[PDB]
Amino acid sequence: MEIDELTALGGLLHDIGKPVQRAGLYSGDHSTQGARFLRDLAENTGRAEYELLSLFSENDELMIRRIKELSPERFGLTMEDVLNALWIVYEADNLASPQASRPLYSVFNPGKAYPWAELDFEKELPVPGDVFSIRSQDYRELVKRLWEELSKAKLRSDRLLPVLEKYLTFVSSVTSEGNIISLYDHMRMTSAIALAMLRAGCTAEDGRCRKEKRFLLIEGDFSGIQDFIYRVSTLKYLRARSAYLELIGWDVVLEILSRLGLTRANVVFNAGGHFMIIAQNTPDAVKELEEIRAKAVEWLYREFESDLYLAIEWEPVSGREFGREGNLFAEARKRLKHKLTVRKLKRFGEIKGLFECNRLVSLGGNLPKLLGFGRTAKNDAGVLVEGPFSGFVPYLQGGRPVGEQILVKNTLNPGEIPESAQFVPYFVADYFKKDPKGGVATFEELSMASTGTRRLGVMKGDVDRLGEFFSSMDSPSKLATASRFMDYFFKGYIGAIIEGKFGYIIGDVPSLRDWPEEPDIVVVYAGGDDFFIVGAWDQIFELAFRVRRAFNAYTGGKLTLSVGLGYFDERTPIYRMADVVSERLDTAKDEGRNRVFVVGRSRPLDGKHKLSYEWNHYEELWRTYAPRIYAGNGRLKGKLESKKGLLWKLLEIRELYVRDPNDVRWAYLTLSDLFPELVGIDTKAVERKEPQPVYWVDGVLKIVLMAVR
Amino acid sequence: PKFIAVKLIPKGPFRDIPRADTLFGAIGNAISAIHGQSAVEELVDAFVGGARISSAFPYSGDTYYLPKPLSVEPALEGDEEERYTTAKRLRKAKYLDLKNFELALRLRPFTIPEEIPYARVDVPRFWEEIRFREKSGVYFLYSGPREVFDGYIAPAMRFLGDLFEVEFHEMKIDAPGSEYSVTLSNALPTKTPVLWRLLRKRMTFIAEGSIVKNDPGGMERLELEVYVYGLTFPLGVELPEG
């Protein structure tokens, strides 16, 4: 071991005494009790390093002796350096900053809380509900499973983090009311900050590091993402373009970590093409950042012209700023967001000369049976694609992992990969309807699987007012929970929601047909609060309500989505579809938020008529009218067989309301017991200054007719 | 400063809201058809001499629209939930009416056009056109000597009219004096610029609305001889410190 790895692991295991106290294993306080747990674990299986890491749970009289008794030579660590690690990690704890049973309360709704369970994208959707105590037993089970995993773990932050993430994701790092920070997040953020001070070189302090700008917030953001992904000459390809962006961002993030020396704990978040890293503020580091930023832009600029740009900035910050005095942290971010906007208004200003496919096809083609990718040098056999700093070698089930680092998909367990390979997990929403050939389904196939009309379904979606949510975060650990939970909804659970899971949570949603076992759906992109999904139009129409509902539950009903839906001719080019659903999406975000653009419509331009529907409006409307006229599975009700025009007549009547809302003919115009809601003249709506029921109905009728044709 | 605005009254739909490189192209080719290459060379000389044309912008009725200067993007912070929504919709706006353009230059508070007078209809078969609104059209600004306007720009525009007709009136823009100016045209910069959007055509152009600091832009000749207009149409702009 060396000083750097020790100070990483030290901040990472500082507060591992917590889960042992709560299990009632050793009878000390969490400080005492955490020391004993690691030390007991060091004796089991003889890896003495854990006894060297047990000092983090605990006038410097006994302390110097107790470290002396452990041999610093055995691990080749200076005794003075070990004290620096202990005090450094001590401070990190404070910057990222009672009944045993309290659970973790949801960062989305501090009133509701999480039932103890481990992170698992198959088993169930995390839903904040009522506050239950967690039994002492459940912590015991935790602490044993934990102990067994730590036994076989390789003692490298990259092998530690994933076992801490599994087991400690849903535990309250402090057992107070309304505490919102996941323990795993506090631990990584303490490992993150502590390593930054060490790389910083500050030492012998007990505010030089704290009241002195010895840290670096680094925010990296891509611009031109959708211009890069869509706007192509095929879904297989379009999936590889999105897959290729994820690697490029990794290639940068890792290189940043590599050249500054840091660990993945310094990665606060990395989704939606947006990353943040806490780092050291040494002149060596800003130089390495400046060197890296220019090389990435040059390679990105050479590879895709002006299509995709990487804006990168960093603000010198101090330890004061990592917390609230009188909210600084948000303010430190806001000033960095500004540097970052300004840099997007200087695209490629790191190129002085600015003012003077087959690989992806194979990658898309070989997309199904791969477990990950190896981050090797560019000149290396088997490299399938290359990012700014590195080649990427597809890692298959049978094959051997190749590279300093290995990126493995959708798992926190390394599996059989080498001991010297740095393990880097990444999650992605990669559902896809498989074709008869093992390959992903085509726009044509997907459009064939629809009920009624043969249209391709597209939806683009976004979480509303996310910036304000992430700004309200007081501290690094809070920002870490907020972002990790958010990202895991899209990257972790949208697949589940597609398969048909979470029925009892989701409930009755608008739908045209019985939900299938192998749904005709293909995720293009989903992660970091945005998503793009295509499939059979009726299955896409329904998945929109399923995703909004799951998301409503996943949060405390405290966050909302905006979605735009499109139903296109299968021959329609990809880029046009993007443009129209994009237009439809930010129309829904523009007419308020928390609303869905169900289907294109005709309306009066009197500024009193929205194209969009508030979700609960459309949902209630469907619950009302669809059962009276629609029987399900692409079949109208029997009474309306040979009465299909009646529906077409209502659409034409609505038009006369669209001609002029003020003309009362649609009253003149109106079995009569069907649709009584539209016959009367609405008086409250006239007073409220709102549209007439008649205006709204087409959203249901046009969808039913589409399914019935 | 006061400028000649040349209004294009369109007979039917448009396929390009043309920017300044293409307007110059069109006018260059039109000048050659009317007077021969020598005159084109005289036109290029007037332009390198100091004369400028803007890119074309929409107008509606007696409302002239101009491109939102990027100077205001970094300054929008100058309610919590009211600021978030509006900032983005203001960041999205590509045009401003003359009144609010003048404000945006001096960094004062200003508003966005509610409805803009054109719509890109893209009919499927697939290609698209621009539908103008009633008494709505596109215009561009000329600054320079009148004899050059009468001698070259006016005749050229007549000839290009024969898909539209042409009329032109004096137009004034009040603009703060400053070291910094917006471009009302798309430009091939000489120096690295302050704030910009790149434009791809192949050639890399700074977009309309970009900010420069004492940059005239330039022209380029090539062989495919044909000149490509990349000169800047500078109006003074107040910048925030940052």
Side-chain angles (χ1 to χ4, degrees):
Chain A
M1 294 299 296
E2 293 177 350
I3 61 171
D4 59 316
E5 293 189 322
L6 161 67
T7 59
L9 306 174
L12 209 52
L13 295 174
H14 181 277
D15 280 337
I16 199 176
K18 301 202 166 176
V20 297
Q21 160 179 89
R22 291 193 297 274
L25 295 174
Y26 283 156
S27 78
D29 76 326
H30 87 86
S31 310
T32 306
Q33 186 173 355
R36 264 203 281 267
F37 173 80
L38 277 187
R39 186 208 301 165
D40 181 65
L41 174 44
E43 288 150 17
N44 206 50
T45 299
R47 316 305 162 164
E49 312 150 323
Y50 280 120
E51 175 162 16
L52 168 61
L53 295 174
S54 67
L55 295 174
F56 292 114
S57 64
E58 293 177 350
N59 314 330
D60 311 69
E61 290 181 340
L62 275 66
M63 294 300 291
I64 294 169
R65 292 173 296 180
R66 290 181 184 174
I67 292 171
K68 183 178 179 180
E69 183 280 335
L70 276 157
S71 64
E73 293 177 350
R74 181 184 61 181
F75 306 119
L77 299 176
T78 301
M79 182 288 301
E80 306 179 337
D81 295 356
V82 175
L83 296 181
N84 289 337
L86 295 174
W87 281 121
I88 294 169
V89 161
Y90 169 83
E91 196 43 60
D93 196 275
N94 212 326
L95 306 183
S97 166
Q99 293 177 335
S101 64
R102 302 286 202 69
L104 170 58
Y105 295 78
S106 178
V107 65
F108 310 122
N109 180 348
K112 314 206 168 186
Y114 287 110
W116 160 245
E118 81 192 9
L119 182 158
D120 193 335
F121 293 144
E122 318 179 333
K123 289 189 189 293
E124 202 43 24
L125 177 89
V127 175
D130 300 317
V131 177
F132 300 111
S133 64
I134 301 157
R135 295 176 145 193
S136 57
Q137 314 153 352
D138 301 294
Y139 275 124
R140 295 176 64 186
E141 182 57 75
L142 177 63
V143 160
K144 293 179 179 179
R145 293 164 84 78
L146 170 53
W147 156 288
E148 293 177 350
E149 295 302 320
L150 278 179
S151 297
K152 290 182 181 173
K154 299 296 183 181
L155 295 174
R156 262 208 272 94
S157 44
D158 63 306
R159 305 303 179 107
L160 177 63
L161 286 157
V163 310
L164 295 174
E165 208 209 281
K166 266 189 167 193
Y167 304 115
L168 304 191
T169 189
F170 286 123
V171 175
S172 195
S173 64
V174 60
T175 55
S176 55
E177 293 177 350
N179 181 76
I180 294 169
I181 294 169
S182 170
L183 181 59
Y184 167 78
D185 290 328
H186 188 264
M187 312 208 292
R188 69 203 268 239
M189 286 324 302
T190 59
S191 179
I193 291 164
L195 185 47
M197 316 182 95
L198 170 79
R199 304 302 181 181
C202 86
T203 182
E205 295 302 320
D206 59 288
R208 184 105 35 275
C209 300
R210 176 160 208 287
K211 307 187 190 199
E212 199 160 36
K213 291 173 179 172
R214 295 232 192 182
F215 298 103
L216 263 192
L217 299 172
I218 301 167
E219 194 163 5
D221 179 86
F222 280 81
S223 73
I225 289 168
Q226 58 188 61
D227 290 339
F228 164 96
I229 294 169
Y230 322 113
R231 308 149 207 297
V232 167
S233 313
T234 63
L235 178 66
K236 293 179 179 179
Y237 175 21
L238 182 137
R239 233 160 177 281
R241 299 294 299 271
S242 187
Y244 186 18
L245 170 70
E246 286 295 341
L247 293 179
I248 292 162
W250 274 119
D251 198 351
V252 171
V253 175
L254 290 170
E255 185 75 33
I256 299 183
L257 298 176
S258 193
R259 288 206 202 171
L260 287 189
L262 294 173
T263 189
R264 187 164 49 80
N266 297 278
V267 181
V268 174
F269 62 78
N270 170 36
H274 216 149
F275 68 69
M276 178 186 288
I277 290 164
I278 294 169
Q280 67 279 26
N281 192 31
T282 70
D284 289 345
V286 296
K287 189 183 316 191
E288 272 298 349
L289 295 174
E290 293 177 350
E291 251 195 49
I292 294 169
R293 180 218 271 147
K295 194 164 155 197
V297 186
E298 300 193 342
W299 180 92
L300 297 173
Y301 177 90
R302 300 181 181 180
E303 215 20 69
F304 307 89
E305 293 177 350
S306 150
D307 268 23
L308 181 69
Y309 172 58
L310 181 57
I312 308 176
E313 279 299 341
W314 56 79
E315 200 183 16
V317 175
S318 68
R320 288 169 176 171
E321 285 175 308
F322 281 133
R324 198 144 138 180
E325 293 177 350
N327 182 337
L328 280 171
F329 185 54
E331 269 291 310
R333 278 166 44 59
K334 205 154 195 185
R335 296 193 313 275
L336 175 60
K337 175 73 212 100
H338 188 259
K339 290 205 213 277
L340 295 174
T341 59
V342 169
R343 174 58 72 184
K344 295 188 219 172
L345 296 174
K346 305 166 77 92
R347 300 182 61 179
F348 297 95
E350 310 99 356
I351 292 188
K352 195 148 292 184
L354 187 58
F355 301 130
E356 293 197 354
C357 289
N358 289 337
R359 296 306 183 77
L360 307 85
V361 191
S362 64
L363 177 63
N366 274 208
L367 177 63
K369 337 135 197 179
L370 92 172
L371 302 175
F373 301 92
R375 176 169 129 105
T376 44
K378 292 172 164 177
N379 174 2
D380 196 284
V383 153
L384 185 39
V385 296
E386 293 177 350
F389 306 107
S390 64
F392 287 98
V393 175
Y395 164 56
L396 295 174
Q397 187 81 57
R400 293 182 183 174
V402 175
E404 293 177 350
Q405 301 78 40
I406 303 301
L407 280 151
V408 181
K409 176 175 76 181
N410 298 336
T411 59
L412 278 189
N413 295 135
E416 289 184 28
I417 66 168
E419 293 177 350
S420 84
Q422 293 177 335
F423 165 67
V424 175
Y426 73 105
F427 306 101
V428 64
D430 69 302
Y431 184 92
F432 64 91
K433 174 56 183 273
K434 293 179 179 179
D435 238 6
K437 332 188 174 188
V440 66
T442 73
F443 292 97
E444 196 190 314
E445 295 302 320
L446 285 175
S447 179
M448 284 199 209
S450 64
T451 304
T453 59
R454 293 182 183 174
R455 310 268 191 88
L456 177 63
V458 187
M459 90 184 185
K460 209 222 190 72
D462 204 78
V463 179
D464 315 306
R465 293 182 183 174
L466 183 56
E468 183 178 2
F469 176 84
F470 280 155
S471 167
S472 70
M473 304 333 283
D474 289 328
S475 67
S477 53
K478 267 191 208 195
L479 171 57
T481 304
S483 64
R484 183 178 61 90
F485 284 11
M486 196 71 208
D487 188 38
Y488 286 165
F489 177 80
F490 299 92
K491 279 187 175 171
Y493 290 122
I494 294 169
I497 299 168
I498 295 166
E499 293 177 350
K501 291 195 196 159
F502 319 141
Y504 174 77
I505 299 66
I506 279 165
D508 289 345
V509 296
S511 64
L512 295 174
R513 61 186 303 269
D514 292 311
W515 194 257
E517 183 178 2
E518 261 179 39
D520 306 84
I521 298 299
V522 183
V523 176
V524 166
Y525 191 28
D529 109 279
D530 184 1
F531 61 79
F532 196 90
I533 297 178
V534 303
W537 73 264
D538 54 316
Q539 295 168 53
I540 286 288
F541 165 85
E542 178 172 352
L543 188 63
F545 300 101
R546 286 177 181 274
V547 175
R548 176 257 174 175
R549 270 208 206 293
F551 187 74
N552 184 69
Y554 184 87
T555 63
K558 272 312 204 304
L559 285 181
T560 61
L561 290 176
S562 290
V563 173
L565 288 171
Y567 315 122
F568 306 110
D569 184 300
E570 67 204 314
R571 291 184 306 264
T572 307
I574 65 169
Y575 79 78
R576 189 220 158 201
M577 292 168 149
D579 179 28
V580 170
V581 297
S582 302
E583 183 153 356
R584 283 177 172 199
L585 172 48
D586 45 42
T587 301
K589 300 182 300 180
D590 185 292
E591 323 204 304
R593 288 144 148 86
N594 190 33
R595 44 207 308 127
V596 60
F597 203 103
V598 177
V599 64
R601 286 206 289 164
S602 67
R603 50 149 176 179
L605 308 164
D606 59 329
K608 302 318 303 164
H609 294 283
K610 292 171 164 175
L611 294 172
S612 305
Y613 291 89
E614 293 177 350
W615 294 99
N616 283 163
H617 192 29
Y618 188 83
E619 278 174 28
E620 285 172 331
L621 295 174
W622 183 276
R623 293 182 183 174
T624 304
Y625 298 122
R628 307 221 220 86
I629 74 171
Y630 187 70
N633 283 99
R635 305 302 179 272
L636 195 66
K637 274 282 196 174
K639 304 255 165 179
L640 295 174
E641 268 298 0
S642 77
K643 286 194 172 181
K644 193 171 170 193
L646 295 174
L647 306 183
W648 286 109
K649 293 179 179 179
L650 296 170
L651 295 174
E652 272 273 22
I653 301 153
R654 203 195 73 92
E655 286 310 315
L656 306 197
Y657 178 94
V658 171
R659 293 295 169 277
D660 289 345
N662 325 296
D663 188 323
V664 187
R665 43 202 170 180
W666 62 264
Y668 176 77
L669 186 152
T670 54
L671 298 168
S672 306
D673 292 309
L674 177 63
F675 302 106
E677 295 302 320
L678 295 174
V679 300
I681 300 164
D682 184 1
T683 72
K684 284 190 180 177
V686 209
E687 293 177 350
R688 294 187 178 259
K689 283 301 304 148
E690 286 156 346
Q692 295 295 297
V694 175
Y695 170 64
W696 292 121
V697 164
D698 64 322
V700 173
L701 289 182
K702 292 169 63 180
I703 292 289
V704 159
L705 288 175
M706 292 177 72
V708 175
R709 214 180 302 126
Chain B
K2 70 197 197 215
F3 304 119
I4 300 164
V6 175
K7 276 180 39 156
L8 277 50
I9 295 96
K11 183 81 170 185
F14 262 40
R15 293 182 183 174
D16 289 345
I17 294 169
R19 60 217 329 164
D21 71 291
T22 63
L23 274 162
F24 179 89
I27 296 170
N29 300 357
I31 303 301
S32 300
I34 289 209
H35 300 291
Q37 292 170 17
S38 57
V40 176
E41 295 288 348
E42 292 173 353
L43 176 69
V44 168
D45 289 334
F47 268 28
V48 175
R52 292 294 182 277
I53 64 163
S54 81
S55 293
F57 305 118
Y59 68 89
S60 212
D62 61 356
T63 302
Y64 282 133
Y65 288 62
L66 280 165
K68 183 190 183 69
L70 304 182
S71 74
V72 303
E73 306 283 46
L76 292 158
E77 293 176 42
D79 186 32
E80 290 177 15
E81 281 196 303
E82 287 279 1
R83 293 182 183 174
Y84 296 136
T85 59
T86 59
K88 297 181 179 59
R89 301 322 293 207
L90 295 174
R91 187 180 306 276
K92 284 165 188 188
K94 214 140 169 203
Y95 293 115
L96 297 181
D97 184 1
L98 174 67
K99 182 168 68 78
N100 297 342
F101 175 76
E102 293 177 350
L103 291 173
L105 292 179
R106 256 176 276 274
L107 291 184
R108 307 202 201 157
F110 62 83
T111 46
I112 304 310
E114 293 177 350
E115 293 177 350
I116 311 95
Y118 77 100
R120 294 185 185 174
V121 175
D122 61 356
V123 175
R125 286 189 157 193
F126 59 88
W127 291 95
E128 80 278 89
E129 291 165 322
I130 294 169
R131 299 270 214 275
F132 268 95
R133 181 177 181 170
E134 293 177 350
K135 293 179 179 179
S136 295
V138 168
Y139 75 106
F140 73 82
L141 295 174
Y142 169 81
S143 64
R146 179 73 189 203
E147 55 265 61
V148 169
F149 185 77
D150 285 331
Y152 305 82
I153 281 54
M157 287 315 304
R158 293 182 183 174
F159 182 78
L160 293 166
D162 309 294
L163 305 181
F164 64 93
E165 298 157 33
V166 164
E167 95 184 2
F168 30 68
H169 328 66
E170 211 187 75
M171 209 210 75
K172 293 179 179 179
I173 306 178
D174 190 11
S178 163
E179 304 200 300
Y180 297 109
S181 44
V182 190
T183 59
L184 295 174
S185 86
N186 62 320
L188 300 160
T190 59
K191 305 193 151 186
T192 71
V194 182
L195 291 168
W196 73 93
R197 291 200 335 274
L198 281 172
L199 177 63
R200 181 81 179 159
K201 284 190 175 174
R202 294 183 181 277
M203 294 300 293
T204 49
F205 273 102
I206 294 169
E208 298 87 347
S210 64
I211 312 299
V212 303
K213 195 192 86 154
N214 203 351
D215 185 338
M219 291 213 74
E220 268 168 18
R221 171 149 34 65
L222 61 82
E223 291 208 91
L224 295 174
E225 303 191 322
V226 61
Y227 299 81
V228 175
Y229 179 100
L231 295 180
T232 62
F233 199 105
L235 295 174
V237 69
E238 275 164 25
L239 285 194
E241 293 177 350

